[PDB]
Structure formats: structure tokens, C-alpha cells
Design a protein around this nucleic acid. Structure first.
Lengths: 174, 155, 194, 76, 45, 60
DNA sequence: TCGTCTGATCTCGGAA
DNA sequence: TTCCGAGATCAGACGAGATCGGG
RNA sequence: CCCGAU
């Protein structure tokens, strides 16, 4: 019965094409669906579309780039600003675009904390060469990291016209 | 640290007493937050007290579903609970109400008023056999064949 | 005890600061010691504020149940001072014949009514109530246009809602609600009033 | 110009919905097909080659519209 | 004048037909036991 | 045993009153796509399916 | 099978 | 004295998964 | 209506 009452009120909602969620009669229930306009289905764990620790380690392993300079802390924050305002990342609303930036500086400080212990990056040459593979973040990866975190964020939006309340009635009822 | 939970209902008489910081006190009765603390706090309890009772039973759920159910339930002025009665105050069309409970009274009363309903939603487009506009019937499709608004002939 | 005859005065001078009057900052925050100047006298009306806009007139009638005659005590000084808005902060409540006397004299003078224990907490600084902001007349026209929405069709808040009654809002105005979230904190919703 | 430039799953379904039913009524095929007899399997070959004679009429709910060619969209 | 004030949209129907002096019988194609209630009327009619 | 329960109905008898397919396998069946499965077909957003599944191949 | 909401009479209480 | 209005106190409603199988 | 399946 509680499945029946729920879906007999919530069935005629769909996220319209200007991201608003309206009733059948045109009246607005939500201005964006759920604040960010994001699918709960495509949503990653913790109610966040990315879980950035997993994507960055995925990018480092799918694209390890040997013979690359991998310099950091002085270039990483500089490459992540040159890429992020580059003809793109306008449709990313700047609540997500802050969240990349606070994660990138969060992994920018992790680099300098290791290079604090040893291994100066004077030009990227110390005598034990292995030390530059401690936290390798080389700028072929960090630009592929952004082009993935953009497109994973853009894909996991609420597709317009998606019977939004009819998803809600199942997900409360089941 | 100390707090105290009551089994009562008189909220603002509890919120106003000496010693209780009334800025931080909640209920679990979403009507007594609506009467006392506005509608917007009554939205946040319907978010909370569902998401409190859903994580209590295991049963993880996205908040974006509860952020929709609460925001439907309180968007017409007051908290409209999803019963037979709350549907009358939410929907205008008759057959969507008439396909729900009280099919006798809802059809006669909308004949007493001269109720012109348009056929929208899904509980009427399914009854009438129209392709519903929710989902795949939202947009419509054109064809891309060779055409132009052409010049006429001289008359 | 006096945690009231003071915090009520603290609340309404938070209230009429939010509604956009000119309360000087030192008059806003009082500790109880700043109100212990009058603290022994008033238990055993000496409390009435007039403030003007950048003009309301609050009342604390010492009668528990304010009757029609008690309103009629300051119906005349309402029209004497040419003041337009008033407040009647009551102890128990109004007599059920007296609430019509507000709506009989509706468009001339406003005179909204509050209870005592309704006002003993500032519901704006409650953690559950988000920051309502009354929008201007031109703030509505840039709202409706961006969403291509008619004035109706917005989500609706009642006129007798506790936060609409706080901010003092007639029918037809649109509040802007900044609901705080966890990923953004700037989940903005609007509400037309009923 | 303001809606999402990604072809939604409800637009891919109906474009494959009606291009299947068009091609099951002897429409001209745009992909020089290779023995597929299911009309639906022809239509996904039409989508991936991005040759479908269909323009999506996207209705903003005020009543205004915004056209989008199926060539001019990002499928998944 | 006073028909719309009872909220009866008079294009749909005036209040004189809230009571029954004639009665439509349903067609035979939608009843191939309600026929038995119809003949019980014409007996009493 | 599955011989007593195997069942398929292509197009057969319709009920005399409402002209929908009948109920039962003894009367050549047709199984009710109930209103709970209507919401499943709503939540997928499949609009043209529901016109096909509740007007075309049931009561045309 | 109560369970619910509704709406319909009474009565002690204040205003003129 | 008056009483006009309002909080208090009964009575009636119309709800309560889905399908499938046979006597 | 019973019964029985899930």
C-alpha cells in the first residue's frame, strides 16, 4: 500500500530541459534536481560523483608516462590552473570545481611532504633516480585527470525528462 | 555532555524555557516543526527523519531521493502528507485523483464543478492512451529531409 | 526569570534589525546586567519601542489576554503618531474576538501579533531554519525571467508561516532561501508567499 | 543553445525508436548495410555512423524550443 | 447570475439537473445484473 | 511440473464485456501487467512502450 | 476491523 | 443583560501488496 | 469463494 500511495502522487514529475523539476501542471517543485542536478544512480559512494582518490590512482596506472619530468608543487598547482580555465569547465558549477581544487592542493601538499623528507627537485635530477617515483603526478596524467573528472561529472547529471519522482517512489518503497 | 529528550509535542513551549538553547532543538513530529519553526525546518525534518530511520535499518539511500520527496511534500504552503487527502491538495486533474482512492466522490464532485482537466501527467495519458510526456515523450522529433519555404510564382 | 523580559527585547531588536530599521548596535546587544537597571521593578508598561526605517511600534501589554479595549488603548496613539506598522507581543494570546479587530482594520495599520514564548527564541538563528531573505521587486523580475516562470508556479510559503510572520511579509512577495548543504552550502531556493 | 549537449538516454531511445520504424517501412538507408535484417540493428549502425535524418525538438517547459541535430550531439 | 457562485460552470451544467426526472439507461454492449436493477425501476415506475 | 504451468498467449479470446484478454490459462490466458509494473515502466521513462503495452496490444 | 480526518453541536467568557 | 465568537466534545466515513493455479 | 504457488 505504501508503494501505491507513494507512486500515485510522485509519478508525474520529470526534470525538464532547463534543469528544473516541475509537476505536471507546470508548478516548480525543485529548481535544480537535488541541488546539483545529479543522478543518484550514476552517483559514486559518499553521494559524490567522483571519489577523486580512486580516479587519480586509476589515471596514474592506466597512463604511467615514463621519460616524463613529473615535477610538482611548483608546476602542479600551475598546470591545474592553466588547464582548468582553458576553453572548458564552464558547465562545471563551481562547487564541484572547488572540490577538484581542494583535492589537487591536497595532493599537492602530499608531494612536498615526501620531498621534505628527502630528494630535492632542483631540476628533477638527484643521483638515486628512483626517488622521483615516490609521488609521480606527471603532467600528462593531471590533464587526463581533469578531462576525466570533468566528463565523469558531466555524464552523471540528471538526464532531462527522467521520471524523477518515479525513481523516488521506487527508491523509498523498495 | 548532557542533553535531554522529551516524549511530548508542545515544541515552542519547550524551546522557550530557561536553560535550553532553543536554537539547537529538533523534533521528530514534522507537523510541530511546521507550526512552530516555519516550513523550511519542516522540510529538513522530513529529510532527516526519513534519512534517520533509513540508516537505522541498514538500507542506504541517496539523499537526492529524500530531497525530492520532502520538497514535493512541502511546496504548496504547508506540509501535504501523501495520503488520500494530501493528493487532493496536490493535484488538479480528476482522473489522477479518480484512479487513486475515493473514485465515487472524486468523479461526482468534479462533475458538480465544471471541471475542465487537461490530459497530462501519466495517470491520465495511460488511461486515455496518449504517449505520456514524462520521459521519452518530453521532446518531439523532426525530420531532416530536403525542404525550404520556397518563392511563389508571379500572378 | 528576567531571561525573558530581556531576551524578548533582545529578540525584537534582532527582529526589527532584520526587517531593515535603524537600531544602533549598542542598543541591540544587552547582557542581563545592562537590563538589571529595571530588573526588580517589572516583576513586582515601561517597555515600548518606536524605530524607523532606513516605523514600527511594538507593544508588551501586561494583560495576559489582550482584549479589544486593550488594543483600543493604542488604536488612538497609533493614528496620533501617524505610524503605520505596529507589533503586539502578548503574554498568553489574543481573545478570539480581538484577532478580527486586526483584520477589520487591515489596510490602514498593520499591527502584527506575536506570542511571548514564540518570541523567546530567535528562529532565524535556529540551526534548522535557513537564511530567508526577502527579495526586492526587481529581484523577482530577474528570477521569473531566468526560469521563464509566471509569478505563480513558484514553490509557496504560507503568509502565517513563522518565518514569514517574522520577516513581516505581505502576499505577493518572494523570499530567497539559502539552504545549506554539504557539497555546496549554497543550495538556493525561492518561495512565493501566499 | 542552453540545454545539455549530451544525447540523453531518452533521446537515444526514441531516435532509435523511430529510425527503426522508419527503416521498417522501406526508408532509404544511410549506412550501406552489411546483411542486418533486424531494423533496430540497422539504426544503431546509423547512429554510430552519425547519419540519421532526425532533428530533436527539445521543449523548454515555458513553451520555447531549441532544435538539435543528431549529428550535433555527443552520444555515449 | 447565481449559477457560477455555486461554482457550477454553467457551460457544463446548471443546478436543475442534480436530480433525476429522466434517466439514461446504459447501452446493452456494456452489460452483456445491472439490467436487473433497471427493470426493477420500470416495475416501480 | 512445468507442463501444467507453461503458458503463452499470442492472440486469442477477449472477454465479452471489456474486450481485454481473459484471465487464466484454461481460457488461453493473458497475464495482467499490473499497476505496480506500470510504475516500473514509468520510472524507466519508456513512454512509447506504455502506449504499446497498454493500448496497442491490449485494447486497440 | 479499528484506524483515521471532518464538521456538527454545546458552554463558559469577554466585549459594548 | 446581552451574546457573538470560539475551544471542546461525538459520529461518520472508506482505506488497507502483487500476481499465478485448480476445483 | 476456498485451496495452493511465489
Amino acid at each position: 500500500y505504501m508503494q501505491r500511495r507513494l507512486v500515485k502522487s510522485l509519478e508525474d514529475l520529470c526534470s525538464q530541459y532547463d534543469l528544473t523539476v516541475r509537476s505536471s501542471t507546470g508548478d516548480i517543485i525543485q529548481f535544480i534536481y537535488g541541488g546539483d542536478g545529479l543522478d543518484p544512480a550514476a552517483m559514486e559512494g559518499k553521494d559524490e560523483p567522483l571519489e577523486f582518490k580512486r580516479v587519480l590512482d586509476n589515471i596514474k596506472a592506466v597512463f604511467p608516462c615514463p621519460s616524463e619530468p613529473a615535477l610538482s608543487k611548483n608546476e602542479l598547482i600551475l598546470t591545474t590552473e592553466s588547464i582548468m580555465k582553458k576553453s572548458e569547465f564552464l558547465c562545471c558549477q563551481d562547487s564541484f570545481l572547488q572540490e577538484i581544487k581542494k583535492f589537487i592542493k591536497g595532493v599537492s601538499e602530499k608531494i612536498k611532504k615526501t620531498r621534505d623528507k628527502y630528494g630535492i627537485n632542483d631540476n628533477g635530477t638527484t643521483e638515486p633516480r628512483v626517488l622521483y617515483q615516490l609521488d609521480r603526478i606527471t603532467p600528462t596524467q593531471v590533464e587526463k585527470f581533469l578531462e576525466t573528472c570533468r566528463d565523469k561529472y558531466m555524464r552523471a547529471q540528471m538526464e532531462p525528462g527522467s521520471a524523477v519522482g518515479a525513481l523516488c517512489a521506487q527508491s523509498i518503497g523498495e | 555532555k548532557y542533553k535531554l529528550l522529551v516524549e511530548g509535542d508542545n515544541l515552542r513551549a519547550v524551546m522557550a524555557t530557561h536553560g535550553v538553547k532553543g536554537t539547537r532543538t529538533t523534533s521528530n513530529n514534522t507537523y510541530e516543526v511546521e507550526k512552530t519553526l516555519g516550513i523550511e525546518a519542516a522540510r529538513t525534518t522530513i529529510i532527516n527523519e526519513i534519512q534517520y530511520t533509513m540508516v537505522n535499518h541498514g538500507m542506504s539511500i541517496d539523499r537526492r531521493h529524500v530531497m525530492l520527496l520532502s520538497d514535493l511534500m512541502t511546496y504548496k504552503g504547508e506540509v501535504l502528507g501523501i495520503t488520500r487527502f494530501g493528493l487532493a491538495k496536490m493535484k488538479e486533474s480528476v482522473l489522477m485523483l479518480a484512479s487513486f482512492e475515493k473514485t465515487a466522490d472524486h468523479l461526482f464532485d468534479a462533475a458538480y464543478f465544471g471541471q475542465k482537466d487537461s490530459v497530462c501527467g501519466v495517470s491520465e495519458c495511460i488511461i486515455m492512451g496518449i504517449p505520456m510526456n514524462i520521459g521519452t515523450g518530453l521532446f518531439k522529433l523532426l525530420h531532416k529531409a530536403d525542404r525550404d519555404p520556397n518563392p511563389p510564382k508571379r500572378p | 526569570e528576567t531571561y525573558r523580559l530581556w531576551k524578548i527585547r533582545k529578540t525584537i531588536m534582532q527582529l526589527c534589525h532584520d526587517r531593515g530599521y535603524l537600531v544602533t548596535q549598542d542598543e541591540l546587544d544587552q547582557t542581563l546586567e545592562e537590563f538589571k537597571a529595571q530588573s526588580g521593578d517589572k516583576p513586582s508598561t515601561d517597555l515600548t519601542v518606536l524605530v524607523a526605517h532606513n516605523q514600527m511600534f511594538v507593544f508588551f501589554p501586561e494583560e495576559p489576554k489582550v482584549g479589544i479595549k486593550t488594543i483600543k488603548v493604542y488604536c488612538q496613539r497609533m493614528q496620533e503618531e501617524n505610524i503605520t506598522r505596529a507589533l503586539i507581543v502578548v503574554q498568553q494570546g489574543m481573545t478570539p474576538s480581538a484577532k478580527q479587530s486586526l483584520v477589520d482594520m487591515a489596510p490602514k495599520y498593520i499591527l502584527e501579533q506575536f506570542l511571548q514564548q514564540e518570541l523567546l527564541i530567535n528562529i532565524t538563528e535556529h540551526e534548522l531554519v535557513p537564511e530567508h531573505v526577502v527579495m526586492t521587486k526587481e529581484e523577482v523580475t530577474e528570477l521569473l525571467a531566468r526560469y521563464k516562470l509566471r509569478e505563480n508556479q513558484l514553490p509557496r510559503i504560507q503568509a502565517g508561516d513563522p518565518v514569514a510572520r517574522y520577516f513581516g511579509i505581505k502576499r505577493g512577495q518572494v523570499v530567497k532561501i539559502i539552504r545549506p548543504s554539504e557539497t555546496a552550502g549554497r543550495y538556493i531556493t525561492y518561495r512565493l508567499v501566499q | 543553445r542552453i540545454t545539455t549537449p549530451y544525447m540523453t538516454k531518452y533521446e537515444r531511445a526514441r531516435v532509435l525508436g523511430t529510425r527503426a520504424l522508419q527503416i521498417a517501412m522501406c526508408a532509404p538507408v544511410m549506412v550501406e548495410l552489411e546483411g542486418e535484417t533486424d531494423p533496430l540493428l540497422i539504426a544503431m549502425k546509423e547512429l554510430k555512423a552519425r547519419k540519421i535524418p532526425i532533428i530533436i525538438r527539445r521543449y523548454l517547459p515555458d513553451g520555447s524550443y531549441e532544435d538539435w541535430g543528431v549529428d550535433e550531439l555527443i552520444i555515449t | 447570475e447565481d449559477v457560477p457562485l455555486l461554482l457550477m460552470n454553467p457551460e457544463a451544467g446548471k443546478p436543475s439537473d442534480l436530480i433525476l426526472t429522466r434517466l439514461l439507461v446504459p447501452p446493452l454492449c456494456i452489460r452483456p445484473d445491472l439490467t436487473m436493477k433497471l427493470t426493477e425501476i420500470i416495475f416501480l415506475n | 511440473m512445468v507442463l501444467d504451468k507453461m503458458h503463452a498467449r499470442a492472440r486469442g479470446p477477449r472477454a465479452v464485456l471489456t474486450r481485454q484478454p481473459t484471465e487464466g490459462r484454461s481460457r488461453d490466458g493473458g497475464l495482467r501487467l499490473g499497476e505496480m509494473e506500470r510504475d516500473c515502466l514509468i520510472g524507466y521513462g519508456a513512454s512509447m512502450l506504455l502506449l504499446e503495452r497498454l493500448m496497442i496490444s491490449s485494447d486497440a
